[PDB]
Amino acid sequence: EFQECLSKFTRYNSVRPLATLSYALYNGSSIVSSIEFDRDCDYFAIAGVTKKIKVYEYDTVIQDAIHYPENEMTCNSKISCISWSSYHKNLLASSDYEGTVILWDGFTGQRSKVYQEHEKRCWSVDFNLMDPKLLASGSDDAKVKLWSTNLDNSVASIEAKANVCCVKFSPSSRYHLAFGCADHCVHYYDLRNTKQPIMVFKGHRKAVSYAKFVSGEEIVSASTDSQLKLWNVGKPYCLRSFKGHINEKNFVGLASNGDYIACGSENNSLYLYYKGLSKTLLTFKFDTVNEFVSAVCWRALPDGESNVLIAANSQGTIKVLELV
């Protein structure tokens, strides 16, 4: 498998920007915290500290230079995370600093559900990838709450030991979920029982800000120790650590598509890794007019070549990038 490790590590050598937009306004903070595509990857949504969710038509963005969103929604506090349903093209959820989880129609702006149980800031929301009704959220109240689109109140809750910074359902099971916690660990659960974690992953020295599923068998986490860690569902200690980027303070975003991992950096750059090798594959440096990349998302076009992704930085600058 050594040969493939090199072929996949040398697959890309350059990056070509296809579009540039701004999340912003009175020189106020315009940090982008979340980027996500809809099921078909026709549209992507952007959210951050301006309290606004902006939806853009992808094909419109990469054609011309002048970028007005398809639709715009407003929250009453900073937005920490967004997630599109994998079942309903228009269903979109947001989490914000009031603790609120809202279910939106991304094109009408109508709210179908307003979940107000988290007693503190909600950091993360994710739709179940194999159950159309279920989604999850995590908050500084040290709780992971499970919601059902057909019910007003949460159907279940996990009581963590510290702040919950990120939640994510498995892409291979409707009953598997992982979340990153301020106890410096990734926790892996089976919602059927919650006494009672399946596994607690130890290694990080600081709070786990992001945790994504590279697959049903591998998790990648990020913490503010300038370290990404690759885990296997079954081993309690990490398989590998990725180094090259600078992440000692801020949430720099994390995204995985297949075998490749992307994360921001506090040198106003994006870093790309191959999950089987610790060394940086390539880097993209944002221009500037102490800034950091704050969000990244793969355009995971099903049945295709995931050669493009979108990243944003603390200045509100957004770039669609093609891996050449």
Short mmCIF file of C-alpha atoms in Angstrom, two decimals, residues 128-271:
data_model
loop_
_atom_site.label_atom_id
_atom_site.label_comp_id
_atom_site.label_asym_id
_atom_site.label_seq_id
_atom_site.Cartn_x
_atom_site.Cartn_y
_atom_site.Cartn_z
CA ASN A 128 -28.68 12.26 10.83
CA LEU A 129 -27.42 10.88 7.52
CA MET A 130 -29.62 7.75 7.64
CA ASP A 131 -32.78 8.93 9.42
CA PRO A 132 -34.75 11.78 7.80
CA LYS A 133 -36.35 12.91 11.07
CA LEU A 134 -33.32 13.08 13.38
CA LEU A 135 -30.64 15.69 14.05
CA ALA A 136 -28.28 16.47 16.93
CA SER A 137 -26.75 19.52 18.59
CA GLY A 138 -24.12 20.23 21.22
CA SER A 139 -23.71 23.14 23.59
CA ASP A 140 -21.62 24.69 26.35
CA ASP A 141 -24.31 23.29 28.67
CA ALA A 142 -22.38 19.99 28.47
CA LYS A 143 -25.23 18.26 26.63
CA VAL A 144 -25.81 16.61 23.26
CA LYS A 145 -29.51 16.88 22.46
CA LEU A 146 -31.32 14.70 19.92
CA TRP A 147 -34.19 16.27 17.99
CA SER A 148 -36.92 14.96 15.70
CA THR A 149 -38.32 17.18 12.95
CA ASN A 150 -41.83 15.94 13.80
CA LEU A 151 -41.62 16.83 17.52
CA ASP A 152 -41.30 20.13 19.37
CA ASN A 153 -39.07 18.85 22.20
CA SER A 154 -35.84 16.87 22.21
CA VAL A 155 -36.22 13.09 22.16
CA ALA A 156 -33.00 12.33 24.06
CA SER A 157 -29.92 13.96 25.55
CA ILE A 158 -26.38 12.87 26.41
CA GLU A 159 -24.83 14.47 29.51
CA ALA A 160 -21.17 15.09 28.73
CA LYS A 161 -18.61 16.06 31.38
CA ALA A 162 -17.74 19.47 29.87
CA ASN A 163 -18.62 21.79 26.99
CA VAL A 164 -19.59 20.10 23.73
CA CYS A 165 -17.95 21.87 20.79
CA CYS A 166 -18.98 19.69 17.84
CA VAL A 167 -21.35 16.83 16.98
CA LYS A 168 -21.45 14.58 13.93
CA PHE A 169 -23.46 11.52 12.92
CA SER A 170 -21.72 8.56 11.36
CA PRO A 171 -22.16 8.29 7.57
CA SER A 172 -22.61 4.52 7.91
CA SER A 173 -25.14 4.18 10.75
CA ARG A 174 -28.26 6.03 11.86
CA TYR A 175 -27.37 5.16 15.49
CA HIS A 176 -23.70 6.25 15.68
CA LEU A 177 -22.56 9.75 16.66
CA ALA A 178 -19.31 11.40 17.75
CA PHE A 179 -18.76 14.71 19.51
CA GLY A 180 -15.76 16.75 20.61
CA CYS A 181 -15.64 17.92 24.20
CA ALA A 182 -13.79 20.49 26.29
CA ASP A 183 -12.35 17.56 28.26
CA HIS A 184 -9.90 17.24 25.31
CA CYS A 185 -11.51 13.98 24.12
CA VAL A 186 -13.65 12.73 21.25
CA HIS A 187 -16.64 10.74 22.51
CA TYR A 188 -18.28 8.05 20.36
CA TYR A 189 -21.80 6.93 21.20
CA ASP A 190 -24.60 4.58 20.17
CA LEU A 191 -27.79 6.54 20.83
CA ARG A 192 -29.59 3.31 21.75
CA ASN A 193 -27.70 3.48 25.06
CA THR A 194 -26.15 6.65 26.48
CA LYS A 195 -25.05 5.58 29.98
CA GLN A 196 -22.34 4.46 28.62
CA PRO A 197 -20.13 5.65 25.76
CA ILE A 198 -18.75 3.26 23.19
CA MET A 199 -15.33 4.93 23.16
CA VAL A 200 -13.57 8.02 24.50
CA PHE A 201 -10.59 9.02 22.37
CA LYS A 202 -7.68 10.48 24.36
CA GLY A 203 -4.63 12.33 23.06
CA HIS A 204 -5.47 15.99 22.54
CA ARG A 205 -4.13 18.50 25.07
CA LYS A 206 -6.87 21.10 24.49
CA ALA A 207 -10.60 21.19 23.77
CA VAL A 208 -11.63 19.30 20.63
CA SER A 209 -13.07 21.99 18.37
CA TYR A 210 -13.97 19.77 15.39
CA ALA A 211 -14.58 16.08 14.75
CA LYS A 212 -15.53 14.68 11.34
CA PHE A 213 -16.00 11.18 9.93
CA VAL A 214 -13.46 10.41 7.23
CA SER A 215 -15.52 7.22 6.86
CA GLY A 216 -17.56 4.85 8.97
CA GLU A 217 -14.22 3.47 10.21
CA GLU A 218 -12.15 6.62 10.79
CA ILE A 219 -12.63 9.90 12.65
CA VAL A 220 -10.48 13.02 12.28
CA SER A 221 -10.48 15.58 15.09
CA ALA A 222 -8.98 19.03 15.57
CA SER A 223 -7.94 20.85 18.73
CA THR A 224 -6.18 24.12 19.50
CA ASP A 225 -2.87 22.31 20.08
CA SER A 226 -1.93 22.76 16.40
CA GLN A 227 -2.78 19.09 15.92
CA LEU A 228 -5.17 17.05 13.82
CA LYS A 229 -5.57 13.42 14.89
CA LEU A 230 -6.86 10.47 12.86
CA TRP A 231 -8.69 7.80 14.86
CA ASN A 232 -10.11 4.36 14.17
CA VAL A 233 -13.52 3.65 15.70
CA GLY A 234 -12.03 0.68 17.54
CA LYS A 235 -8.67 1.95 18.81
CA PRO A 236 -8.69 4.33 21.82
CA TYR A 237 -5.41 6.01 20.78
CA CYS A 238 -4.91 7.91 17.56
CA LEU A 239 -3.52 6.38 14.37
CA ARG A 240 -1.62 9.49 13.29
CA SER A 241 -1.14 13.19 13.95
CA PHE A 242 -1.00 15.86 11.25
CA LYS A 243 1.28 18.88 11.60
CA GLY A 244 2.10 21.90 9.47
CA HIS A 245 -0.72 24.31 10.21
CA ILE A 246 -0.84 26.76 13.12
CA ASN A 247 -3.84 26.39 15.44
CA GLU A 248 -3.22 27.55 19.01
CA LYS A 249 -6.14 29.95 19.54
CA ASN A 250 -8.99 29.98 17.02
CA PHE A 251 -11.47 27.57 15.47
CA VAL A 252 -9.94 27.12 12.01
CA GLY A 253 -12.49 24.76 10.45
CA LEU A 254 -12.12 21.13 9.43
CA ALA A 255 -13.37 19.23 6.38
CA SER A 256 -12.78 15.74 5.00
CA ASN A 257 -13.63 14.27 1.58
CA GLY A 258 -12.70 10.62 1.11
CA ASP A 259 -8.95 10.35 1.72
CA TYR A 260 -8.12 14.07 2.02
CA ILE A 261 -8.35 16.40 5.02
CA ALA A 262 -8.44 20.20 4.96
CA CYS A 263 -8.16 22.63 7.86
CA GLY A 264 -7.50 26.33 8.35
CA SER A 265 -4.45 27.92 9.90
CA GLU A 266 -3.62 31.03 11.91
CA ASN A 267 -1.25 32.18 9.15
CA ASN A 268 -4.29 33.06 7.00
CA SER A 269 -3.89 29.89 4.94
CA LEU A 270 -5.60 26.60 4.19
CA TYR A 271 -3.76 23.29 4.62
#
